[PDB]
Amino acid sequence: DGTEKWRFKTGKAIEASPVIGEDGTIYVGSNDGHLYAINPDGTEKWRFKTGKAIEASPVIGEDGTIYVGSNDGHLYAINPDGTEKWRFKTGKAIEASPVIGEDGTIYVGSNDGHLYAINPDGTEKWRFKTGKAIEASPVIGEDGTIYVGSNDGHLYAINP
Amino acid sequence: DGTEKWRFKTGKAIEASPVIGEDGTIYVGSNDGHLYAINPDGTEKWRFKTGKAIEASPVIGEDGTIYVGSNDGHLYAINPDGTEKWRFKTGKAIEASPVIGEDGTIYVGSNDGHLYAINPDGTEKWRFKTGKAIEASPVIGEDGTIYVGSNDGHLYAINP
């Protein structure tokens, strides 16, 4: 009927789409800097604070790890209980959601122009420089190709 | 290996993620106003011009229809052959990608503050009003609940 079930208030605007875990938990980032874990009944499970606003949607690894990019420049890996697993610093704000390859590699674009491939342990695999800031989340093709849009006007097909 | 396979040039910045169809076709919206269909070898299959920039990712329905929101306020339904199927006008620009429910309903947020439920034939099912613009795509839970964030700071859970 399109009627409200509940609402959860954050500190500032929510520009990022939520993501749902296997247990039904709804994770959503806000412009107040936090990644909120919301129970399906609208109550807060926990919150994780980053340096600045979170504009990008989080993605969930196969083991339950929640990866989210913050405007503070980091890609955060957060355990299912709300504790930080690791963080990877890029040059500028991360406005785009990460995406996970079939081998566990976490790909994310940064406003510093680079597409980053990050190992599941937080160490850098490689980086590729597009012309300008990357605001679009990358998408993986069936053969492993990583497609990423850049502010330089191009869509790049990157070998894995 | 982090090397470039190919690049596809549009007229302006690509702020939105692409999406891949069943046959490997890559669809991406550009700030130049066009939805591009790109073959896996990097050559253009076709383009469809909307009125303003497209900063939201397209989504693909079960029958291959590509839905894309534009800054001109419309949610376009484009056939796989590049011809428009229908369009749905909202009050303000659409900056968020739509999402498709199990029953085929297409949910899209608009800068007019509403989350719209659109039947596959282009007619409105219902609209859910929030306090401010919706720049974030919605997500659907296993029980059919639709979650969407708003610029009013709230995460809304909405019954189908």
Side-chain angles (χ1 to χ4, degrees):
Chain A
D1 37 9
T3 52
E4 173 176 352
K5 207 171 171 217
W6 45 257
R7 61 183 63 167
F8 185 88
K9 201 210 183 162
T10 73
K12 293 216 178 334
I14 298 178
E15 296 173 27
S17 323
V19 72
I20 284 157
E22 307 260 71
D23 64 343
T25 308
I26 309 116
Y27 311 91
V28 65
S30 170
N31 274 20
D32 64 14
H34 293 79
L35 170 78
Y36 291 90
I38 311 303
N39 296 307
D41 70 338
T43 57
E44 170 174 344
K45 193 184 229 229
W46 45 256
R47 69 180 64 170
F48 186 88
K49 183 143 100 184
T50 74
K52 304 224 140 223
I54 291 176
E55 286 180 44
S57 282
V59 304
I60 301 175
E62 251 193 29
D63 62 342
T65 307
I66 305 106
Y67 310 93
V68 71
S70 185
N71 280 17
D72 65 15
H74 292 86
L75 169 74
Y76 287 93
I78 296 138
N79 294 310
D81 70 336
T83 57
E84 160 168 2
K85 186 170 185 147
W86 47 254
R87 61 181 64 173
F88 186 90
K89 171 91 175 97
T90 73
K92 295 242 180 42
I94 296 181
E95 298 184 9
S97 302
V99 73
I100 303 170
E102 76 156 323
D103 73 337
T105 305
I106 308 115
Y107 306 94
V108 73
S110 170
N111 280 10
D112 68 6
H114 299 254
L115 166 72
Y116 290 87
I118 307 299
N119 294 309
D121 69 347
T123 59
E124 176 178 352
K125 194 162 155 189
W126 50 254
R127 64 181 79 179
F128 177 89
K129 177 65 162 56
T130 69
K132 289 177 176 186
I134 288 163
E135 306 179 15
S137 313
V139 180
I140 302 149
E142 176 54 40
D143 65 347
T145 304
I146 305 111
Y147 305 94
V148 54
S150 165
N151 279 9
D152 67 13
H154 295 80
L155 172 77
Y156 288 87
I158 307 300
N159 297 305
Chain B
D1 43 9
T3 58
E4 162 175 6
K5 191 186 175 102
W6 49 254
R7 66 181 70 152
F8 182 82
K9 178 176 159 181
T10 76
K12 284 177 183 182
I14 298 176
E15 298 185 357
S17 315
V19 73
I20 303 162
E22 291 204 332
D23 64 345
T25 302
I26 303 122
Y27 307 93
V28 63
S30 173
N31 272 20
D32 66 20
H34 293 78
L35 166 73
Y36 288 96
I38 302 148
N39 298 308
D41 69 338
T43 64
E44 176 176 339
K45 189 198 245 271
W46 46 255
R47 66 182 67 164
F48 177 84
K49 176 199 217 204
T50 77
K52 283 183 193 314
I54 295 172
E55 67 182 276
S57 306
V59 302
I60 305 167
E62 293 263 88
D63 64 346
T65 309
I66 307 105
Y67 308 93
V68 57
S70 170
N71 276 14
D72 66 15
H74 290 86
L75 165 72
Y76 291 88
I78 309 303
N79 293 301
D81 62 1
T83 65
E84 174 187 357
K85 187 205 272 225
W86 49 254
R87 62 181 72 170
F88 180 88
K89 184 171 85 132
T90 71
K92 282 170 167 191
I94 295 174
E95 310 174 356
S97 86
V99 80
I100 304 171
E102 191 67 59
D103 64 342
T105 309
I106 310 114
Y107 309 90
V108 61
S110 173
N111 277 17
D112 64 15
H114 291 86
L115 169 79
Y116 291 90
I118 307 310
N119 295 304
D121 71 340
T123 62
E124 176 181 333
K125 211 200 216 179
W126 45 256
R127 62 185 69 171
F128 183 85
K129 184 184 195 173
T130 76
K132 277 201 240 303
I134 299 180
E135 302 179 13
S137 325
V139 174
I140 301 165
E142 200 220 27
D143 72 333
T145 313
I146 310 126
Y147 309 96
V148 69
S150 166
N151 278 9
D152 62 29
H154 286 84
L155 165 66
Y156 292 92
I158 298 140
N159 308 293

